[PDB]
Amino acid sequence: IQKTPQIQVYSRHPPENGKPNILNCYVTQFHPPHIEIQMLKNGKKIPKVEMSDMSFSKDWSFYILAHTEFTPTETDTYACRVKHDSMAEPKTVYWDRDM
Amino acid sequence: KAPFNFATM
Amino acid sequence: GPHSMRYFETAVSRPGLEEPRYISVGYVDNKEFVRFDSDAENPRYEPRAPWMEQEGPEYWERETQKAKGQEQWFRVSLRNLLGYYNQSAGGSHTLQQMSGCDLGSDWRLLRGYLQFAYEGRDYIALNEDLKTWTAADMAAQITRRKWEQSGAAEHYKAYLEGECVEWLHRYLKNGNATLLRTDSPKAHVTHHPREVTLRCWALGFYPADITLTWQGEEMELVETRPAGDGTFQKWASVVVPLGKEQNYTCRVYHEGLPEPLTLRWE
What is the DSSP letter of C244? Predict the structure, then answer.
């Protein structure tokens, strides 16, 4: 059967508006290993996105770290949308600079 | 150095 | 300090693909250090840490060859398991293996590991005695009887007690450069106007294991997460009455620390 993935979205470095930083999408705890991961800027696919090679945890669940160069601004909002057979529709979690 | 496996399941 | 090696092997079949895809990842002290992947143009064990380039082409040819054999093994096993579980043609299936050894700070074998999972679920594992097998599923009894009959355990025991330890010693000698360091965390607290929310941050630490606790007595937290630069992050938050800001202190526990940090809202 299928394990539903857990998702965090967060910046590598403490965020500061107008400063280049990296946005990560840590997707953990899912089975089977086939998964599709998108990072969004204002609702649209980010052009090019870094995708670590798939790996698995001691409990036999797979995990992956997606990341993309970004420059936070006051007004833009960044999200990550995950697609997997545990879910009938995609799952999106928005970035909160305090989290 | 990686293991190699014996009897198949 | 203690040390460890693991190899995590995976084979995946999908309705589309004719042949399954085999991946193996080696770890030393939980840091990835080698990797094979059969979808690669030129399938080979590639180095993954800088300190591993020190191995000549015979190492890599040899390990690669083992990988090609495991791929054979996983392919056949997958086939048999399908039959055991009365699964038919036309599904995704997956088979996973973890193997390796643990050492104490004296560098002696603390314990060996050898477990398998099918469809993400425990299928069969070698007990801590490296002599007997544990297997829950009725379907898995077939493999249990087979392997007990053929002396499988002894040949895994020899690897785990010998090769695994022997070569891990060698890798650590070669890694008395990159792996010695653990990175201590750097803690700070932020304010948010929820009543208010206090949030204790921990940043730039390795390895991942860490503990955060608010006080007073013993809350919202996130799962430990990689910064993406080899270090990790975590925070813990609590809701607090406005003004009562200094009754609460955060504590951070980590193996790199000479002692636990103590901090509050500045």
Answer: -
Q: CATH number of the domain at A4, please.
A: 2.60.40.10
- Contacts of residue A65 in chain C, CB cutoff 8 Å? 226, 228
State the Rg of chain A over Cα.
Answer: 14
- Round to whole Å and give the CA distance between A71 and A89: 29
Chains B and A touch (3+ CB pairs under 8 A): no
Distance from CA of C168 to the nearest CA of B (A): 8
| Number of domain units in chain A | 1
**Separation of alpha carbons C117 and A12, rounded Å:** 33
Token code pair at residue C84:
């055991």
First to last CA, chain A: 31
Contact B7 C146 (CB under 8 A): yes
Q: Which domain covers residue A12, as residue numbers? A: 1-99
Among A24, A60, A62, most C C-beta atoms within 10 A, so best to mutate, is: A60
Domains of chain C: 1-181 (3.30.500.10), 182-263 (2.60.40.10)
From the list C34, C155, C166, which residue is nearest B6 (CB)? Answer: C155
Residue carrying structure tokens 């009754």 = C247
Method of determination? X-ray
